[PDB]
Design a protein around this ligand. Structure first.
Ligand SMILES: CC(=O)c1ccc(B(O)O)cc1
Ligand SMILES: [Zn+2]
Length: 257
């Protein structure tokens, strides 16, 4: 199917997913000097106190920490969102080297990796119904650079040997995603889509300005994962990011000056 190589990478996705050439695709480059501070923006509200993680999965594209979204336990509201968005899963995209990996860029700058905290609007009932709506999803993007170690990430780094190949999964309860958040909630926001197929244009993107630091060893463990499935030729899971897409008829708002 689709992947990230030279034969199935992003530049090929449009053949099986025409919306790849859509009018509100992600990711995009964030021109910090062209984004306009928006007063009407309300303060962001991250209520992850009752978050309940369940499993960690290698899907052959990335690895998802999945949560129990059967109740309003870890929600995202305020900011540009109208209503309540339930956290369903979070994933990363990283590069083969520290100077790449992120999907969004800031003034064309690429980060070592990008963390996506995915939530879906609770007025749609579930995630599968929510992805079919223009305001069905809210994704919290957080950049990752190499530097100091991010303690709240080590628990995820330690379990990755259990999900090395596509399809493998492992119990992963009691993970607190608040350890993955940066100090500040300053953000840019814009209307976009999922960054992998089906590339549905259903996402409100909230990208935090302040990155989180991770050690080179923490990301190195990311690079030891496998695209392939067990017993198959080893393709290392690296550079699983979509490059910046055309901004088109969109303006990026900022929550700060
Ligand atoms: C297919 C799917 O479930 C998914 C795809 C991309 C993202 B993202 O851009 O944050 C999240 C979820
Ligand atoms: Zn993603």
């Amino acid at each position: 199917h689709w992947g990230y190589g030279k034969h199935n990478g992003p530049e090929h996705w449009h053949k099986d997913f025409p919306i790849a050439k859509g009018e509100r695709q992600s990711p995009v480059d964030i021109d910090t000097h062209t984004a306009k501070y928006d007063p009407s923006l309300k303060p962001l509200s991250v209520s992850y106190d009752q978050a309940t993680s369940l499993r960690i999965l290698n899907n052959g594209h990335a690895f998802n920490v999945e949560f129990d979204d059967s109740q309003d336990k870890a929600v995202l509201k305020g900011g540009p969102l109208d209503g309540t968005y339930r956290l369903i899963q979070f994933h990363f995209h990283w590069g083969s080297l520290d100077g790449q990996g992120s999907e969004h860029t800031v003034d064309k700058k690429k980060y070592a990796a990008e963390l996506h905290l995915v939530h879906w609007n609770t007025k749609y009932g579930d995630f599968g119904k929510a992805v079919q709506q223009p305001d069905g999803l809210a994704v919290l993007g957080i950049f990752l650079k190499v530097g100091s170690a991010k303690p709240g990430l080590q628990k995820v780094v330690d379990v990755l040997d259990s999900i090395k190949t596509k399809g493998k999964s492992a119990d992963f309860t009691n993970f607190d995603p608040r350890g993955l958040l940066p100090e500040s909630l300053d953000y840019w926001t814009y209307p976009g889509s999922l960054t992998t197929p089906p590339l549905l244009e259903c996402v409100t993107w909230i990208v935090l300005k302040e990155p989180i630091s991770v050690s080179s060893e923490q990301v190195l463990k990311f690079r030891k994962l496998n695209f392939n499935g067990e017993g198959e030729p080893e393709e290392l899971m690296v550079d699983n990011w979509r490059p910046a897409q055309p901004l088109k008829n969109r303006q990026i708002k900022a929550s700060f000056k």
